[PDB]
Amino acid sequence: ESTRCDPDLVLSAMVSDNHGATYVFSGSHYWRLDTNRDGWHSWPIAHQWPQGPSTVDAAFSWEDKLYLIQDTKVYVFLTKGGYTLVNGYPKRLEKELGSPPVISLEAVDAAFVCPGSSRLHIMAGRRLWWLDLKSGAQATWTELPWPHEKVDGALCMEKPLGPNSCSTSGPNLYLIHGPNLYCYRHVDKLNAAKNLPQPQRVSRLLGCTH
Numbered sequence: 001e002s003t004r005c006d007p008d009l010v011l012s013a014m015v016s017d018n019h020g021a022t023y024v025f026s027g028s029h030y031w032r033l034d035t036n037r038d039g040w041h042s043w044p045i046a047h048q049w050p051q052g053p054s055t056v057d058a059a060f061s062w063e064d065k066l067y068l069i070q071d072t073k074v075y076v077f078l079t080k081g082g083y084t085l086v087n088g089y090p091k092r093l094e095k096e097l098g099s100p101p102v103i104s105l106e107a108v109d110a111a112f113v114c115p116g117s118s119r120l121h122i123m124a125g126r127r128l129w130w131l132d133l134k135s136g137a138q139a140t141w142t143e144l145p146w147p148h149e150k151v152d153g154a155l156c157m158e159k160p161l162g163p164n165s166c167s168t169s170g171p172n173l174y175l176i177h178g179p180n181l182y183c184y185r186h187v188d189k190l191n192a193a194k195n196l197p198q199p200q201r202v203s204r205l206l207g208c209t210h
């Protein structure tokens, strides 16, 4: 194969919840990879995020909150006992996270927060920033170097995506672009890299024969 094993499949976001549930988004649908083996059925976003966005451009989780971003709107859900939209959401992104100095963002491509950090990393185009989630809209975005010109989604977590990790100490840092899945051992490796790393294929991750 379905959209899953399609050569034109493009993912739009990745996120994992405080409980260990990992989701990969493709526009208006998603798949759940941390199942056990509950088919490879792709669900429409509303399946679990009843009142969320139509499509997801980026996603992250911090604490017991799961964030979904659509264009310039952010949706924040509590992961108490099922996802509940937070009162007052969604909100303009600048109202929640502030803004980079010289740019006015219209869309965001990827986001991630590594375990045991309150530092949100956000990417748009060939730019990558970090900001402190503890500072709300007053956050200062610091531009970091990296080797990517464009990404589709990102994810930082202790367990590996697929059978093998690329990090012995910290959590695995994953960036996706088109059919590729890249893994970095730490954010510093990401900032220091001059070439991209051998990618793994997303299709294989999605349970395809190739």
Ligand SMILES: [Cl-]
Binding pocket: 012, 013, 014, 015, 057, 058, 059, 060, 109, 110, 111, 112, 152, 153, 154, 155
């Ligand atoms: Cl993302």
Ligand code: NA
Binding pocket: 011, 012, 013, 056, 057, 058, 108, 109, 110, 151, 152, 153
């Ligand atoms: Na994205």
Ligand code: NA
Binding pocket: 013, 014, 015, 058, 059, 060, 110, 111, 112, 153, 154, 155
């Ligand atoms: Na993400």
